[PDB]
């Protein structure tokens, strides 16, 4: 009764883990569209979750119910090598996606030509090899450093100390989760500055300070370029001489920038207080309609793009005058919705990670502060919950 209740739940759950893992991996070779950099990291995540669903969850619950595996299975070393290697290659892949999106939102042009489907192979391989040299040599050959599995019923030999366990908890969950949460602070507040500025520039037409804030947000976005940052700074200082060089920065990437000069003249020869907002929006639209700047703006039009930014970009296109700008705006917001889906997927995986690893982590923190604080059943629930993250991961992509 009690034994069969647990076993049924994790037997069907393991099937959902590996079926989704097997389906997505063969889907990369089925459709040649899911090999891109953004989805390449998901491939490594899927391989890791496949490993820890095939060889870690099943054996974990088999140990938990049929306690006949304690100190009786010599494949436990391989099982935990795969376990820790896949778990760490999922943690490092989560932080690698976090750093990749932070550098694609704050350095989106240095990373434009530095994030291709061939450098993804190198980045993913470096992450996987780092996880390997961390765990697989260690988890396996630490015993040789006690030839048998050192007193190991199923567990890992070198994770036996409160300080060592706390250090792993920090450097794998704690420190990475705070790091990711810091880049999420930066990215969320950055996209929020962009969205609030571009909304006060659309919901208010008499606030020249909101326009300055929008230009400052764009400069914080487009800081890699000398030309673009110089143009934004000059446009901010124009309203907040050497204005001849201003058109040199405007005519440095002229594809449809002919109307940019006309808008600049109209907004700087009439001492405009609101036509500068139209100029800023036309500049944003022109930047968006570029093969290199599209992800840069698309990242910032991910968060606040409910209603305000669609209207803002539409007004900018209507002021720019592009013959066919509606299709360009539709494509730009399609890219923005793709960025929104990617960000929501990142948030879902991060929240599942934090909602399934925290409990174990929290109990690890209190395992050095009055150690006798939680019973064995709560610990087992937390440890199994950590594996539940693998089950959700294919479902995160599918939704
Ligand atoms: C031990 N298993 C269960 C399920 C997967 C793995 C990790 C979870 O435990 C942790 O979070 C540690 C850090 O303390 C850790 C160790 C290796 C890599 C990343 C993170 C619990």
Domain boundaries along the sequence of the chain: 2-160+388-398, 190-337
What the block records as the tokens of 125 is: 């391989």
| Burial state string for 148-186 with b = 16 or more CB within 10 A and e = fewer than 16 | ebeebebebbeeeeeeeebebbbebbbebbeebeebbee
Contact by Cβ (8 Å): 260, 247: no
Q: Is 383 in the pocket of ligand 1 (CB under 6 A)?
A: yes
What gap in Å lies between CA 267 and CA 83, rounded to an integer? 61
What the block records as the tokens of 102 is: 């932070």
Q: How many CB atoms lie within 10 A of CB 317?
A: 24
What gap in Å lies between CA 379 and CA 361, rounded to an integer? 10
Q: Measuring CA to CA, how many Å separate 365 from each of 135, 158, 184?
A: 22, 18, 23
- Surface-to-core class of residue 10, CB atoms within 10 Å of its CB (0-12 exposed, 13-18 middle, 19+ buried): buried
Nearest to 187 by CA among 220, 161, 160, 223: 220
What gap in Å lies between CA 124 and CA 115, rounded to an integer? 12
Q: Is 44 in the pocket of ligand 1 (CB under 6 A)?
A: no
Alpha helices in the chain (DSSP H): 2-30, 37-52, 58-65, 76-106, 119-141, 162-168, 175-200, 208-221, 227-239, 244-250, 258-268, 275-288, 294-300, 308-320, 325-365, 376-398
- Tokens 């405007």 belong to which residue? 250
Helix axes 308-320, 325-365, angle to 10 degrees: 150
Q: Is 360 in the pocket of ligand 1 (CB under 6 A)?
A: yes
Distance 27 CA to ligand 1 centre (A): 28
Provide the experimental method for this PDB entry. Answer: cryo-EM
Q: Whose CA is nearest to atom 4 of ligand 1?
A: 386
What gap in Å lies between CA 384 and CA 269, rounded to an integer? 68
| Fold of domain 2-160+388-398 | Rhopdopsin 7-helix transmembrane proteins (1.20.1070)
PDB resolution in Å: 3.3
Q: Is 60 in the pocket of ligand 1 (CB under 6 A)?
A: no
């Amino acid at each position: 009764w009690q034994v069969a209740f647990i076993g049924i739940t994790t037997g069907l759950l393991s099937l959902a883990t590996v079926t989704g893992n097997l389906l997505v991996l063969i889907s990369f070779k089925v459709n040649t569209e899911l090999k891109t950099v953004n989805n390449y990291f998901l491939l490594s995540l899927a391989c890791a979750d496949l490993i820890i669903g095939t060889f870690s969850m099943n054996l974990y619950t088999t140990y938990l119910l049929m306690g006949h595996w304690a100190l009786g299975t010599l494949a436990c070393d391989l099982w935990l090598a795969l376990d820790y290697v896949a778990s760490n290659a999922s943690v490092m892949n989560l932080l690698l996606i976090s750093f990749d999106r932070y550098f694609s939102v704050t350095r989106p042009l240095s990373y434009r030509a530095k994030r291709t489907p061939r450098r993804a192979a190198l980045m993913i391989g470096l992450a996987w090899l780092v996880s390997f040299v961390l765990w697989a040599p260690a988890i396996l050959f630490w015993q040789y450093l006690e030839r048998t599995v050192l007193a190991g019923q199923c567990y890992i030999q070198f994770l036996s100390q409160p300080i060592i366990t706390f250090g792993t908890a920090m450097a794998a969950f704690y420190l990475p989760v705070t790091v990711m949460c810091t880049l999420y602070w930066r990215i969320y507040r950055f996209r929020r500055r962009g969205a609030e500025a571009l909304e006060r520039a659309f919901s208010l037409e008499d606030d020249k300070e909101a326009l300055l804030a929008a230009l400052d947000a764009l400069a914080e976005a487009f800081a890699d370029d000398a030309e673009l940052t110089a143009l934004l700074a000059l446009l901010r200082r124009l309203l907040e001489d050497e204005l001849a060089a201003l058109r040199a920065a405007l005519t440095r990437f002229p594809e449809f920038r002919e109307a940019l000069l006309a808008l600049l003249d109209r907004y700087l020869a009439t001492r405009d207080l609101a036509d500068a907002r139209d100029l800023v929006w036309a500049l944003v639209l022109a930047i968006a309609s570029d093969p290199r700047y599209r992800p840069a703006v698309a990242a910032m039009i991910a968060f606040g793009d409910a209603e305000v930014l669609r209207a803002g970009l539409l007004r900018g296109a209507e002021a720019l005058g592009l013959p066919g700008g509606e299709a360009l705006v539709e494509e730009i917001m399609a890219e923005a919705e793709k960025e929104k889906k990617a960000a929501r997927t990142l948030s879902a995986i991060l929240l599942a990670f934090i909602l399934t690893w925290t409990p174990y982590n929290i109990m690890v923190l209190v395992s050095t502060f009055c150690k006798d604080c939680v019973p064995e059943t709560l610990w087992e629930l937390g440890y199994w919950l950590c594996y539940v993250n693998s089950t959700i991961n294919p479902m995160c992509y599918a939704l």
